[PDB]
Design a binder for this molecule. Structure first.
Ligand SMILES: Cc1cccc(Cc2cc(=O)n3c(c2[NH+](C)C)SC[C@H]3C(=O)O)c1C
Ligand SMILES: Cc1cccc(Cc2cc(=O)n3c(c2[NH+](C)C)SC[C@H]3C(=O)O)c1C
Ligand code: NA
Ligand code: NA
Ligand code: NA
Lengths: 236, 229
């Protein structure tokens, strides 16, 4: 990702060092008075919320490289009571107080544009997810999650599109945003397996019916085509 | 809205003029290769997607003042095949080709940041809506929509907090598995349709079932939230 690589260089040019995080650590949390801009450079994370109940909700997944901002750029206050949790074994991120991101973007329109364009990708992603859920319910959500895993981590092989993510991480991620390990989601995923949309072979998982995923997550498929055309193109 | 007024000033001094649109017009559309930045100054709109078979999906609502961009600021290509449909009787909008926008956000950081903040407000709004639906289902979604309408358009009257939208606009907003939720809300005294208007009589109930949207509105719109808290 050339744009992201230039942004990493711009951060280091202004003296910002990478931090390392491990699975289950919070890169930012909902109780901190200070908000941050996170440039997630490598790894996989999830945005989480807590209900008055104490119940944790998984709201959104992010993978490096991407930008996640916990506060509004102008007011510097929280956009929501959210935590950013690491789900890969390790992650690398740049952690910038929001006031400082402002100074940085204001002196380079190219990098300003890069961060702005990430928010635009988020916005459209959410609408696409909403449209697919509206049409196909949880099946649409789950096919969309698998579709984006296929595009991002998939490699064509004789046995189909191999998902190149450790099995440990990959099973977690098959579960769409929402409550953790829902019974209903498990039964949707294993039904896709039973119908050989995604199959276990020689210790790996292979997507064998990409067209099925595309059929039930059509708006996320359009989203990926429009937002990430080269990655989309590889497998279409 | 002072940030919105300052942005309006900056546009008009850079030659960009307000356009008036009537109900049902598309300020931008899903078949147009040219993408746009819309500064919706006044009125109510909805983002839609129309399928091959004619089915119209309602995806998002917006009210002036707000910013809606149909294209990516860097590539200038579509963010999704969407229309922006006017649902108020009239709307006023500043329509900027996306290539031209880049030049003007460049020369004024303050306005760049205003537009940037709008995207953040949309992102967090979508997440909050998702969160309330995950917790409380369709009841959460409907309470949330009623809650935001109460904060933004509500007027205190002897009959309760009247949602002061042109009746015609209320139909456009959706007012039959939904039909059974509205009836339940009337039965439990949470709302009433009196005469030609809509009245909220138990605001705590709405807040109860749309907690994450309420939190969103507190965080994003503190002055407005504060009028009824
Ligand atoms: C690991 C994972 C699985 C499903 C969905 C997502 C969200 C996601 C993936 C993705 O590839 N991109 C985005 C998202 N969302 C944050 C919209 S924004 C554009 C693109 C990118 O990362 O460049 C993930 C991470
Ligand atoms: C007419 C309407 C009804 C329900 C929900 C919305 C969305 C909405 C309302 C709102 O007041 N605000 C936003 C939205 N969404 C566009 C996030 S962004 C922050 C705030 C504002 O208007 O400044 C609407 C318009
Ligand atoms: Na925080
Ligand atoms: Na291709
Ligand atoms: Na368009």
């Amino acid at each position: 990702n050339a744009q992201a690589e230039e942004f990493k260089k711009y951060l280091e040019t202004n003296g910002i060092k990478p931090k390392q995080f491990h699975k289950k650590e919070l890169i930012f949390n909902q109780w901190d008075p200070q908000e941050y801009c996170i440039f997630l450079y490598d790894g996989i994370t999830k945005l989480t919320s807590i209900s008055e109940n104490g119940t944790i909700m998984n709201l959104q997944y992010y993978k490096g490289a991407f930008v996640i901002m916990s506060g509004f750029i102008d007011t510097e206050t929280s956009v929501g009571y959210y935590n950013l949790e690491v789900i890969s074994e390790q992650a690398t991120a740049y952690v910038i107080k929001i006031n400082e991101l402002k100074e940085l973007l204001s002196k380079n329109l190219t990098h300003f544009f890069y961060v702005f364009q990430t928010l635009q990708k988020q916005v459209s992603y959410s609408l696409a997810k909403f449209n697919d859920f509206s049409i196909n319910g949880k099946l649409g959500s789950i096919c969309g999650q698998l579709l984006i895993l296929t595009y991002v981590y998939g490699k064509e092989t004789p046995d189909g599109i191999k998902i190149t993510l450790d099995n440990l991480t990959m099973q977690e991620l098959g579960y769409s945003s929402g409550i953790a390990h829902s019974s209903a989601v498990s039964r949707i995923i294993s039904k896709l397996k039973q119908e050989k949309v995604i199959v276990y072979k020689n210790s790996c998982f292979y997507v064998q019916n990409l067209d099925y995923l595309k059929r039930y997550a059509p708006k996320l498929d359009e989203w990926f085509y429009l937002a990430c055309p080269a990655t989309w193109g590889k497998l279409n």
